[PDB]
Amino acid sequence: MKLIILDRDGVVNQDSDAFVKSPDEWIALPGSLQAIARLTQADWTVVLATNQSGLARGLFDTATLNAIHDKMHRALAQMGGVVDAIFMCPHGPDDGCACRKPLPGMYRDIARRYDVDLAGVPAVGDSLRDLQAAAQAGCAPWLVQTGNGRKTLAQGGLPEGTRVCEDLAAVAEQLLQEA
Ligand SMILES: [Mg+2]
Ligand SMILES: [Mg+2]
Ligand SMILES: [Zn+2]
C-alpha cells in the first residue's frame, strides 16, 4: 500500500479564525481536492488526521461535522478522489486526551488500522503540531504554506528533514514526480 496522511484545515480546506462550523464554512483550497484525486488514481490510500476542538467547544455537533465531510466527499468523488478514512480528535486543548496533536495518538491509531509501519509515510500539515505529531509517530513530515504554514515555516523548530511546499497540490506533484 501507499499511505499518505493529511491534516484537514489549512491543507485540504481553508483554515478559519472562527473555526469551520458548517458546510458553507468549508471551502476547498485551490488544487487540494485535485491533488487527492491524483493520489487516489495513483493507488494511494489517503487518510485525514484532524484536530476538531469545535466539538468539545460546542460550536457544532457531529451531524454537522458529518455534513461537512459529506460535502468534501461529494466534491472529491466527482474528480475521482477518495479520502479512505478520517481520524479526528474532538477534544479541546486542555482536555487531556491521547489524540490531540502534537500528541501522536491519531497517527498511532492509523498505523494500527492498516497494520503498517509509518516509516517514510508522508504526513502533510500546515501547523507545527502536525509536523511534531507525525514525526513522533515515525512519518516523513511535509509542511504546506497555506493555512498556518507560512507562520510555521518562519518560526522554525521543524522536525529534521521536513519538506516544504506551497500547497497540497504541490506536494502531490512532488510525490508523483519522485515516484
Ligand atoms: Mg491545520
Ligand atoms: Mg497552488
Ligand atoms: Zn483528542
Q: Parallel, antiparallel, or unpaired: how do β-strands 3-6 and 45-51 relate?
A: parallel
d(Cα 98, Cα 179) in Å, to the nearest integer? 34
3-class DSSP state of 52: coil
**Is 96 exposed, middle or buried, given 0-12, 13-18 or 19+ CB atoms closer than 10 A?**
exposed
d(Cα 34, Cα 23) in Å, to the nearest integer? 19
Order across the sheet with 3-6: list the strands: 85-89, 45-51, 3-6, 122-125, 140-144, 163-165
3-class DSSP state of 174: helix
**For cell 468523488, what's the residue?**
77
How many residues would you count in the chain? 179
Which structural domain range is residue 85 located in? 2-179
**Nearest C-alpha neighbor of 130 from the set 5, 3, 4, 1:** 5
49 CA to centre of ligand 3 in angstroms: 11
Structure determination technique employed: X-ray
d(Cα 149, Cα 168) in Å, to the nearest integer? 11
- The cell numbers describing 31, all together, are 488544487
d(Cα 91, Cα 82) in Å, to the nearest integer? 26
Query: How many separate domains does the chain show?
Result: 1
DSSP state letter for 126: S
CA distances, 88 to each of 3, 8, 39, 91 (Å): 17, 10, 21, 9
The angle subtended at Cα 20 by Cα 15 and Cα 23, nearest 5°, is 120
Interacting residues of 8 by C-beta distance below 8 A, sequence separation 6+: 48, 50, 86
52 is known to lie in a ligand binding site = yes
150 CA to centre of ligand 2 in angstroms: 14
- The cell numbers describing 170, all together, are 504541490
CA distances, 162 to each of 16, 35, 90 (Å): 25, 20, 27
What is the CB neighbour count within 10 angstroms for residue 144? 31
Resolution for this PDB entry, in angstroms: 1.7
d(Cα 177, Cα 99) in Å, to the nearest integer? 33
**Nearest C-alpha neighbor of 123 from the set 1, 21, 11:** 11
- The cell numbers describing 87, all together, are 481520524
Q: Which residues lie at CB < 5 A from ion ligand 3? A: 89, 91, 97, 99-100
70 catalytic per annotation: no
Active-site pick, 9, 61, 70, 117: 9
93 CA to centre of ligand 3 in angstroms: 9
Q: What is the CATH number of the domain that holds 84?
A: 3.40.50.1000
d(Cα 38, Cα 122) in Å, to the nearest integer? 15
Dmax of the chain from CA atoms? 43
d(Cα 59, Cα 106) in Å, to the nearest integer? 22
51 is known to lie in a ligand binding site = yes
